[PDB]
Amino acid sequence: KLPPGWEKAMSRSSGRVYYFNHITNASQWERPSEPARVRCSHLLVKHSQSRRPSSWRQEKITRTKEEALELINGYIQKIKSGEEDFESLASQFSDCSSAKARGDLGAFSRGQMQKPFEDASFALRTGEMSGPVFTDSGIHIILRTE
Ligand SMILES: O=C(O[C@@H]1Cc2c(O)cc(O)cc2O[C@@H]1c1cc(O)c(O)c(O)c1)c1cc(O)c(O)c(O)c1
Ligand SMILES: O=C(O[C@@H]1Cc2c(O)cc(O)cc2O[C@@H]1c1cc(O)c(O)c(O)c1)c1cc(O)c(O)c(O)c1
Numbered sequence: 001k002l003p004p005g006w007e008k009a010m011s012r013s014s015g016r017v018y019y020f021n022h023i024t025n026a027s028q029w030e031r032p033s034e035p036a037r038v039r040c041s042h043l044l045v046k047h048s049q050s051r052r053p054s055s056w057r058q059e060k061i062t063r064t065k066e067e068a069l070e071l072i073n074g075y076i077q078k079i080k081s082g083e084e085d086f087e088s089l090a091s092q093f094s095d096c097s098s099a100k101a102r103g104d105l106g107a108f109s110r111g112q113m114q115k116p117f118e119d120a121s122f123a124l125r126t127g128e129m130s131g132p133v134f135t136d137s138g139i140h141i142i143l144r145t146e
Pocket of ligand 1: 013014
């Protein structure tokens with residue numbers, strides 16, 4: 001039995017099975033391996049429909065949801081290939097002020113964060129990273145650190 005959110009799927013290009021998580025939007029070839037609090041970092045990319053279309057990076061955020069998702073997807077690719085660390089990309093590109101702490105949000109319990117972010121955070125095991133996670137803030141890559 002796979003951990004919460006995890007399902008088995010089949011690659012359309014290769015035919016090999018892989019696993020994906022409908023809570024975190026994580027996807028991976030490898031078969032995957034609750035606390036009161038978790039600690040996470042996150043890289044946020046805002047779009048024009050974000051609850052506040054503004055950040056420390058850009059006074060007015062005009063990119064579309066679709067453009068934001070492409071950016072998030074490129075960052076996940078660089079992180080997964082090891083070309084860049086999550087921390088480096090968060091510091092340079094995240095629209096959240098936690099960028100200045102390499103994305104770190106510190107520790108939190110259920111009841112504090114936006115719900116899709118929270119659910120993703122608590123479905124990650126320590127060390128694991130989400131796929132694109134959508135909230136009223138924009139699109140997040142989430143990394144569970146504790
Ligand atoms: O539906 C296929 O792709 C989906 C749409 C799509 C696209 O439009 C452009 C692109 O860059 C990637 C891409 O990934 C999609 C996709 C979805 C899956 O669930 C999947 O397992 C996969 O390998 C891929 C598909 C079917 C195929 O039969 C196939 O041989 C293939 O290589 C791909
Ligand atoms: O401009 C942002 O903060 C404002 C300026 C600022 C600063 O220069 C240094 C500092 O120590 C704190 C600080 O608080 C300001 C602030 C203003 C608000 O109206 C607000 O709601 C808020 O959370 C905070 C900002 C951008 C962001 O992108 C962001 O994620 C964020 O939380 C905050």
